[PDB]
UniProtKB/Swiss-Prot annotation, chain A:
A beta-D-glucoside binds at Q27, H131, N179, E180, Y322, E395, W446, E453, W454, Y462. GO terms for cellular component: chloroplast. The gene is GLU1. Reversibly inhibited by micromolar concentrations of Hg(2+) or Ag(+), but irreversibly inhibited by alkylation in presence of urea. Competitive inhibition by p-nitrophenyl beta-D-thioglucoside (pNPTGlc), glucotetrazole, and para-hydroxy-S-mandelonitrile beta-glucoside (dhurrin). This is 4-hydroxy-7-methoxy-3-oxo-3,4-dihydro-2H-1,4-benzoxazin-2-yl glucoside beta-D-glucosidase 1, chloroplastic. Is implicated in many functions such as ABA metabolism, hydrolysis of conjugated gibberellins, conversion of storage forms of cytokinins to active forms. Also acts in defense of young plant parts against pests via the production of hydroxamic acids from hydroxamic acid glucosides. Enzymatic activity is highly correlated with plant growth. The preferred substrate is DIMBOA-beta-D-glucoside. Hydrolyzes the chromogenic substrate 6-bromo-2-naphthyl-beta-D-glucoside (6BNGlc) and various artificial aryl beta-glucosides. Optimum temperature is 50 degrees Celsius. Loses activity when is heated at 55 degrees Celsius. It is found in: Plastid, Chloroplast. One of its GO terms (molecular function) is cellulose 1,4-beta-cellobiosidase activity. It comes from Zea mays. It is an enzyme of class 3 (hydrolase).
Length: 490, 495
């Protein structure tokens, strides 16, 4: 269901508000080895462990955007988009990932052509420096963001950002240092469903030698050190009175399981372990109190000089919202003990509350339940607790299932009203939040293109534009994308 | 300052401002007023010892060997309450004056169960409901000298005697008293007795400046507190089957300072929460749900004992009414977890400081005279709303509230000024009015007790402070005179 008068109209938001779509470098690029591109960490994972991909697939082609960016810009423009959020392949720019491994010239040419073409068509680029693709070269030289020396990674990351600032600084006016560090670290060294795939012994991931209790924090700590270092560099030599830098946090809105004041407390620790873990540091200069008290020693401290670079190290914040959960309290005692870094929030995240019903109508996959109301909740917390800063909904959408046993007909795939409904609703929620005081300034539909979904392989289509992989990645606009064209063009 | 800015005439609390069933009274402490520490073979309490062997720990070196010698003037005491039209009267029973050994083997003091016996009937013969406090910091030196008192490691050598000093009370008294209070201000007791050691016996960690610097400021306060909690459920359960009655009620008295964030930051809001926890929740949460509050279990960790499920049962819901002792409030400023900070007292586990001055330099409220009471009636409302909205909105009795006029050797307080306590009158009228606003807001408060119906001994403060609404002439025959406050209260109840 949906509704006539309740349908978001472009003239519901200010003119300067921005609307666009987003994608990930590894998910759409392909050309995994074309033109001297280095081996990313995911290239390795997929190739050597196809048994960690729901369908054993990989992104050696993706949506072949590396060769078809011309059309990607073409869709966007006929869709009348205001901006395009894409990410840059660290391996494609720095094959060895280091300054001295050399700067691959082809990769620079690509992002220049894409950026220029996006600009000639009046589309603003919102670039994500790092979107999970860590050069495999660094992965073996000192264990990527798992570097316990805190320096190699920070310097190797900082130099990468500098190269980006140097070759795309005049055209790119909006930067994002990292994309969802909470996940990346949690999924790469906690559950281990992400590359490299480490985890505590006994658990089931590719390299069960890791430590789901101490690794996520180590990698996440470096990330924050790299952000502060890159942003320091940005503010000192590249920042213009009209350019911005920041980062995107993954986030699900938490809600009390029952009614006990205990579940409200769980909710708080939940928002903390999820959003605050990385937000609090870039805002005040240190992690959430809760975490320092529940993960005690397993969470490094920061030198005063670091606490200083991190605080206020942003002009805008990116929010990636999909669903929400119920947070039920879990008391401290001898009967319980944390398995994952995430179990430190001494709270469980349910989908179904005490009434047995789902926190929202299922959207098709194993985790997306529609609850746009949690979106407003998050927008009010940013507003009332963390200074109501410029927020951009950098990701939002759903993923239609399309597998071997239950392939999804192209005619049906193209008629995504479950998605069209989902988008309209969240976009309407931004009109409610704005009226409620939020400082949101834009929305990005997740996956302008159908593409690789990490461990989910090609079983899900998140795009608003259909990609025929068994053709020549030919593209066909979905109903959602067509509404978005009417929304922007009207 | 000296001048009192009082409430506008129209703003002055009237009696018909509250329901006919609300109750108004005054309160006192056994050791503080009784005196007669030994008369009639009464066992030595822990404070008798402290004061006698350590008069250096008393600001004026005195003790309460006589106090307000109420032991012989209970008739006069009740007569004042009658005149003032008081509805109830809170008081405590002296442990060593029922069992100079706190145990069966030690027996009982005939004249002990006599004193309190007459006291009650007399009170009941004037329409004055009695609210008795089972334990009020007075421990029989018997137990303290035996197994350290409430520092019992076993968790029963002391849970036995108490459950016995208690049970035996319900025997000779639980027949007239319709409202009981197991303990009074456990937090203060523990933290002051085995943390900063200002309270008998005076145990604080090495390096610290107390009488016996060999204790552990970070653990003892947590064990003594642990014991008191068990001793409570034990007793209460006993009273819930051997002395229970439909028109009776039972609970405990919690001391509590209001908490308000120091600054605008959300970090200070968080500090405030841990502060309400280390103070009120430490003991409240246990009797409400069965276990201490999350924050403490995370900040104090191992130092905070656990409970057996057959204990997490006898504590959960062990009360029909709760007692609140409110005096002042504080600003809670966040203090982060880091290599540069480590706890020294059991109270430092709140990772928060309790300021009196705000970031604007000014006091959270006007100083009332002594070293710690700042008038902030709003804090009382905040508390009542938490009891309401978070802890079930149970029956609350403001069991203590008042101020202490300073009276020392170097700065004697003339009886004339002592008798005109407009600073105290204003403090009471303001807190009483705050209850009227709390009642309209939904709070389930049902009574108010003025702290110290009598001028008396003030623990480590000795006789330097007069908290009474009735002046006591110790340099006479403890002759009593009503202060201006007590006179208004008589008009408030009588009008």
């Amino acid at each position: 269901m949906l509704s006539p008068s309740e349908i978001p109209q472009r003239d519901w938001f200010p003119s300067d508000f921005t609307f666009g779509a987003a994608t990930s470098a590894y998910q759409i690029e392909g050309a995994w080895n074309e033109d001297g591109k280095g081996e990313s960490n995911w290239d390795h994972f997929c190739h050597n462990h196809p048994e960690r991909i729901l369908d054993g697939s990989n992104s050696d082609i993706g949506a072949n955007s590396y060769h078809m960016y011309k059309t990607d810009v073409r869709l966007l423009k006929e869709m009348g988009m205001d901006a395009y959020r894409f990410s840059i392949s660290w391996p494609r720019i720095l094959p060895k990932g280091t300054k001295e491994g050399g700067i691959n010239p082809d990769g620079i040419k690509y992002y220049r052509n894409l950026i220029n073409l996006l600009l000639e068509n009046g589309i603003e680029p919102y670039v994500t420096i790092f979107h999970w693709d860590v050069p495999q070269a660094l992965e073996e030289k000192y264990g990527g963001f798992l570097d316990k020396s805190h320096k190699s990674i920070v310097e190797d990351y900082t130099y990468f950002a500098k190269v980006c600032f140097d070759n795309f600084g005049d055209k790119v006016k909006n930067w994002l240092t990292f994309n969802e560090p909470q996940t990346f670290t949690s999924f790469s060294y906690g559950t281990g469903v992400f590359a490299p795939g480490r985890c505590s012994p006994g658990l089931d991931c590719a390299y069960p030698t890791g430590n789901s209790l101490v690794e996520p924090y180590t990698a996440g700590h470096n990330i924050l050190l790299a952000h502060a270092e890159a942003v320091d560099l940005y503010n000192k030599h590249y920042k213009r009175d009209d350019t911005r830098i920041g980062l995107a946090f993954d986030v699900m809105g938490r809600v009390p399981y029952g009614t006990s004041f205990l579940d409200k407390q769980a909710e708080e620790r939940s928002w903390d372990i999820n959003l605050g873990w990385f937000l609090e540091p870039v805002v005040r200069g240190d992690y959430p109190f809760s975490m320092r008290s529940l993960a005690r020693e397993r969470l490094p401290f920061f030198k005063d000089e670091q606490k200083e670079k991190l605080a206020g190290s942003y002009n805008m914040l990116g929010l990636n919202y999909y669903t929400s959960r119920f947070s039920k309290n879990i008391d401290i005692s001898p009967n319980y003990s944390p398995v994952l870094n995430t179990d430190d929030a001494y709270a469980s995240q349910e989908v179904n509350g005490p009434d047995g019903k789902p926190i929202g109508p299922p959207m098709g996959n194993p985790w997306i339940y529609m609850y746009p109301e949690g979106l407003k909740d998050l927008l009010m917390i940013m507003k009332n607790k963390y200074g109501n800063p410029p927020i951009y909904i950098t990701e939002n959408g759903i993923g239609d299932v399309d597998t071997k046993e239950t392939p999804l007909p192209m005619e049906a795939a193209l008629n995504d009203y479950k998605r069209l409904d989902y988008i309209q609703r969240h976009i309407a929620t931004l009109k409610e939040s704005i009226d409620l005081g939020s400082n949101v300034q834009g929305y990005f539909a997740w996956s302008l293109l159908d593409n690789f979904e990490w461990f989910a392989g090609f079983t899900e289509r998140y795009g608003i534009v259909y990609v025929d992989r068994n053709n020549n990645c030919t593209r066909y606009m979905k109903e959602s994308a067509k509404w978005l064209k009417e929304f922007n063009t009207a």
